[PDB]
Amino acid sequence: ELKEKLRDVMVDRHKVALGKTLGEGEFGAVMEGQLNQDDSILKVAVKTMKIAICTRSELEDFLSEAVCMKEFDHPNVMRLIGVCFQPAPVVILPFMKHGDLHSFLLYSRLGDQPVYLPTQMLVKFMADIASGMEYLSTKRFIHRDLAARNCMLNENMSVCVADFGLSKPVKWIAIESLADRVYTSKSDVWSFGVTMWEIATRGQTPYPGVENSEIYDYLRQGNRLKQPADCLDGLYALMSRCWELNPQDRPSFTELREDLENTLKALPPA
Ligand SMILES: Cc1nn(CCO)c2c1-c1cnc(N)c(n1)O[C@H](C)c1c(ccc(F)c1Cl)C(=O)N(C)C2
């Protein structure tokens, strides 16, 4: 009656086969994996969190969030496959062969094979995040860790929002969230403005030369991310609106999706 949701979210550790490591972190390790989906085998991403559970309430909260994340059904939102325990929690996600959005933007210029991404492709990436964020907003979900690095690329080169701040940096957090530790969908809008800038600059570091400890004062003194020379006044106006001091002055994710889609049809395809 109650735990019928635990039945779905749980994944048998004897059906998961680890392969090559995809990357290392401070919060865990991620590997390429094979999931025995009874009759079929599925290529997955396996994130094992280095930080183990120490209380019943911590184990309770993880499993609640996991059920919330498995309920996500949108083309621009990562669909959580399931959860394990190595107790250290494990997370099973679909295998996204094109990797994270930040790495893609960063390798486009700073790679051995440097290809210039057209403004329309960049505006579509932004539109893809706002669509997934509009979905999460309606489902009353707060991401808390929105960034190009936490955005995945589908096989159709479509972007989808991922992570969902489950491992709960500063340069994406809204001014009110740095100050009061209060998080809303309006603070997610701020983070999205930073992400749009991250896409427009093609993976540049927000606030260069500013340290995380200086960030609150830098923002508090009125400073915001400067407009890129190659970026359109209209696109930068959308960014700036997300960084408005008063959260109620910031646009909604439905508003952003519309303005981004409007500018996208005006631009060349595809
Ligand atoms: C194929 C691949 N190459 N690379 C490195 C180049 O991008 C990665 C992946 C990969 C693929 N599919 C997944 N579902 C997946 N990871 O999920 C991770 C848990 C994940 C990240 C990063 C951000 C983020 F949003 C998530 Cl969900 C990660 O740790 N990576 C190592 C990214």
Is there a binding annotation on residue 6? no
**Hey, what are 192's tokens?**
């999205």
Distance CA 198, CA 174 (A): 15
Q: Where in the chain is the domain with CATH 1.10.510.10?
A: 96-270
Closest ligand 1 atom, CA of 96? 12
Burial of 155 (0-12, 13-18, 19+ CB in 10 A): exposed
How far from chain centre, in Å, is Cα 115?
24
Task: Find the residues whose C-beta lies inside 6 A of ligand 1.
Answer: 22-23, 30, 45, 47, 78, 93-97, 99-100, 103, 150, 152, 162-163
CA–CA separation, 138 and 92 (whole Å): 25
Rounded to the nearest 10°, the torsion over CA 184, 189, 190, 191 is 100
**CA 234 / ligand 1 centre spacing (Å):** 32
Residue linked to tokens 């309920």: 71
Our mutation pick for probing the ligand 1 site, out of 18, 24, 30, 50, counting the most ligand atoms within 8 A of Cβ, is 30
- Cis peptide, bond prior to residue 52, ω within 30 of zero: no
What are the start and end residues of each CATH 3.30.200.20 domain in the chain? Answer: 1-95
**What is the Cα Rg of the chain in Å?**
19
Q: Which residues pair with 45 in a beta bridge?
A: 32, 93
Q: Which residue has the tokens 């490591």?
A: 21
165 a known binding residue? no
Question: Which residue is associated with the tokens 């972190």?
Answer: 25
Is position 25 annotated in a ligand binding site? yes
The tokens for 114 are 């440097």
Q: Which CATH architecture has domain 96-270?
A: Orthogonal Bundle (1.10)
User: Any known ligand binding at 24?
Assistant: yes
Cα 111 to ligand 1 centre (Å): 19
Ligand 1 center from residue 41 Cα (angstroms):
19
Active site amino acids: 145
Distance 28 CA to ligand 1 centre (A): 12
**Ligand 1 center to 147 CA (angstroms):** 13
Q: What is the 3-state secondary structure (H, E, C) of the chain?
A: CCCHHHHHHECCHHHEEEEEEEEECCCEEEEEEEEECCCCEEEEEEEEECCCCCCHHHHHHHHHHHHHHHCCCCCCECCCCEEEECCCEEEEEECCCCCEHHHHHHHHHHCCCCCCCCHHHHHHHHHHHHHHHHHHHHCCCCCCCCCHHHEEECCCCCEEECCCCCCCCCCCCCHHHHHHCCCCHHHHHHHHHHHHHHHHCCCCCCCCCCCHHHHHHHHHCCCCCCCCCCCCHHHHHHHHHHCCCCHHHCCCHHHHHHHHHHHHHHCCCC
Phi, psi of 143 (to 5 degrees): -65, -55
Q: Which atom of ligand 1 lies nearest, measured to the CA of 22?
A: 31
Measured by CA distance, the residue closest to atom 21 of ligand 1 is 100
Compute the C-alpha angle 13/15/17, nearest 5°.
85
Is 159 annotated as belonging to a binding site? no
How many other CB atoms are found less than 10 A from the CB of residue 220? 12
State the resolution, in angstroms: 2.8
Distance CA 13, CA 35 (A): 9
**CATH number 3.30.200.20 is the correct assignment for the domain at 1-95:** yes
- What amino acid occupies position 248? Q
Encoded tokens for 195:
């992400």
Ligand 1 atom with the shortest distance to the CA of 151? 25
